[PDB]
Amino acid sequence: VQLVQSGAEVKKPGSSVKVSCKASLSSYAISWVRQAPGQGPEWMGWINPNSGGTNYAQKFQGRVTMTRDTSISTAYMELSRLRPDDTAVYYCASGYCSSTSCYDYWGQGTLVTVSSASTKGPSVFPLAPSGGTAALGCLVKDYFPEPVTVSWNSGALTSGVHTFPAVLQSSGLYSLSSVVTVPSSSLGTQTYICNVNHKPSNTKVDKKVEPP
Amino acid sequence: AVLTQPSSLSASPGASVSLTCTLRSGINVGAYRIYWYQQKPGSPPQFLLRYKSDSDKQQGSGVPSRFSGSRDASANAGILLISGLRSEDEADYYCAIWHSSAWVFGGGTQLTVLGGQPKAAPSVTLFPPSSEELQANKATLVCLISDFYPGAVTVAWKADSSPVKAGVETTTPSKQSNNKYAASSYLSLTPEQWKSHRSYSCQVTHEGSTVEKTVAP
Amino acid sequence: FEDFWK
């Protein structure tokens, strides 16, 4: 039914990473494809599960190893001497084709972040507050690596909320903000808390936004 | 430049659209099976169909019939056709071939499906640095543009009357819950830079109409 | 049948 990959990885330039792709194996080749942020897919190679025979793309020939363990039925992809440009979501994929149709299977993907930056939790700052509306939000600044999640009042407030995509700053740290439009009548009475969770650094912050 | 796709395409629901995957001259389209994939944000690419000719084509398992392949020898371009054009079809579309003993992918086409949204003027809110960030010895001006359609804006910063590009990071317009667009831009300074200047401006241009908001220490 | 990636 399913390919399931290992969790996210954060690495320093020059180190290596090993991503696993466990079938819930095949007799058909498991191909590895990566996708850099805001880019198209890039084929890395395939491995034959029966033989263990590999075929790497020329770009990665030298610093990639693809292996398999048919006992536990998981494919591995190790990329060596990592570059910042190797920052991507790495997918595993396999399938087969009849004369009629084709049946492809992709993993969920594994974000690998390569940078000389170290894991760091975000500094959360409140953005204190027309047709009777007021704008307020939270600024989630200077964190690494990327995946943070922002809710409002522990997810109870969805309407009129927008969490922006992250910006990779020149410093090598990420930043985003989340906004919520609320009526002006509510600012003194109704409490608005943004819940910032950065799981890579195990940092949870709950900041209430108030008018000064 | 083996495979090239158009960057963007927009059409309304119910109609049909054609997506091209242009092959470099000499790499004859008639000799290759063109693989097509759909990718919605957050998920892996999902296979649609592969097409060489009308005699040689394979659909994706559980992929509707309205997705169909085609080609054109003169243009040297494989074609993907979509008939239903449900709003579900809004995604990035990549083509791929097996060329010179390697899988090559295209740059991708971003297909936008229009939801009959009327033109909306952007609401711009420029936030000064919070007291907490200032006590942390940092400063970030947050200019938040929202509730505009269509989703194309240009953002410009000014310290006093001098235009700024240094310390600016801007997000590409992204879809809201209400199918209008929002965009965020950040001008990161020091507290000393923040207070040294007298005003900071965030100019937003949408459909040839300009909105500018200002904040001062 | 046939392999998808070959």
Author numbering:
A (entry chain H): 3 to 26, 30 to 134, 140 to 222
B (entry chain L): 2 to 218
C (entry chain b): 11 to 16
List sentences quoted exactly from the publication behind this structure:
CXCR2, a member of the chemokine receptor family, is mainly expressed on neutrophils. CXCR2 is involved in neutrophil chemotaxis, which normally follows inflammatory stimuli. Here, using an epitope-guided approach, we selected a combinatorial antibody from a 1011-member library that binds CXCR2 in the same epitope region as IL-8 (also known as CXCL8), but with picomolar potency. Structural and Hydrogen-Deuterium-Exchange mass spectrometry analyses demonstrate antibody interaction with an N-terminal region of CXCR2 that is part of the IL-8 epitope.
Further analyses of the supernatants using fluorescence-activated cell sorting (FACS) showed that only one clone, H8 (abN48), recognized the membrane-bound hCXCR2-mCherry on U2OS cells. The H8 (abN48) scFv antibody was overexpressed, purified to homogeneity, and surface plasmon resonance (SPR) analysis indicated its KD value of abN48 with pepN48 was 2.6 × 10−9 M. To optimize binding of abN48, the scFv was first converted into a full-length IgG1 antibody, abN48-IgG1 and its KD value with pepN48 was determined to be 7.8 × 10−10 M. The improved affinity of the IgG1 compared to the scFv suggested the Fab form could be further optimized using affinity maturation by yeast display. In the presence of abN48-IgG1, the HDX rate of residues 11–18, particularly residues 13–16, on pepN48 decreased considerably, indicating their possible location at the interface between abN48-IgG1 and pepN48, in accord with the reported binding of IL-8 to the N-terminus of hCXCR2. Apparently, the affinity-matured abN48-2-IgG1 preserved the binding mode between abN48–IgG1 and hCXCR2, albeit with higher affinity. AbN48-IgG1 and abN48-2-IgG1 differ by two residues in CDR3, i.e., Ser99H to Arg99H and Ser100AH to Arg100AH. Why these arginine substitutions in abN48-2-IgG1 result in a 100-fold increase in binding affinity is not obvious from the x-ray structure and suggests a subtle global stabilization by these residues.
